[PDB]
Write a protein that binds this ligand. Sequence first.
Ligand SMILES: COc1ccc(-c2ccc3c(c2)CN(CC[C@](C)(C(=O)NO)S(C)(=O)=O)C3=O)c(F)c1
Ligand SMILES: [Zn+2]
Length: 299
Amino acid sequence: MIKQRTLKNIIRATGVGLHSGEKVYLTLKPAPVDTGIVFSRTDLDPVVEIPARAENVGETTMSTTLVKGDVKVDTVEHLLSAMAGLGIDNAYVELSASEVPIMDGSAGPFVFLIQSAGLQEQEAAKKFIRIKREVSVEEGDKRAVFVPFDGFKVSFEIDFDHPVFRGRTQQASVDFSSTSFVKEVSRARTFGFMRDIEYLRSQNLALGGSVENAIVVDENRVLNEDGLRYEDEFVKHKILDAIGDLYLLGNSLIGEFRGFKSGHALNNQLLRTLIADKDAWEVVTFEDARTAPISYMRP
Ligand SMILES: COc1ccc(-c2ccc3c(c2)CN(CC[C@](C)(C(=O)NO)S(C)(=O)=O)C3=O)c(F)c1
Ligand SMILES: [Zn+2]
């Protein structure tokens, strides 16, 4: 069968929240079968746990935020993308502060630490959410779609009137039914504009943000000394974001996601819309990895 996966070993990372600027200690732990990804504020007494599930999304403003009462876990999308990309079903994610560390602004450092620690297959069928019917949401200009697809593939298009974007509108489509995640999207960094930065810092947003953890876009140029990891790094990062927001379903997807100027807000409306429409999806397992439409890296 395709089996559930957890961490082989505990991972510890220190970093800074992108939005909060707060210093945060991250500990990823193995978790039992069917735990899913559960975030835990270990700075609070008692400790507050929040499953990474669509129903626990609060603010979807400049990040995906999980809420339980007053308690928030901010900017989960890059870590969850890493979890989803590597096929990790079960883990505890402990944080000493509200926000996941931004690292280099990609999922790269997370996939490096996880893959260094290694993965543990568990004696239980991995569950997938299979898209059975088209499901679509639109906030005027913006579109987010699930389509039936025998595998896992993500298409995105952004279209910002800004000279940095080649003049050519950056679009990408990636099939992740095999092992393209690490190579293709893992290293694509978040990005923001010199134009917006003083106002956002006014709203206590992007306080931790620097060239060290983001693509910083001037009027006409990327400011980073070393420029871009990829020609389409911007749209690849939007794909990384979508994979993490989609993992809030709680299981890997069998289907196609298509985003059109989509962000955290619309991604979350699409999951809620999907979850409501029970004829549009079912949960499937695979007793024989050889006939499954998804394959995973050696553990
Ligand atoms: C040093 O100068 C600057 C200027 C602007 C920024 C900056 C300003 C704002 C933002 C970011 C960076 C990253 N970031 C998150 C981006 C975004 C929300 C995202 O990646 N979410 O996962 S996105 C690409 O979907 O729009 C911001 O909103 C900075 F970090 C530094
Ligand atoms: Zn992002």
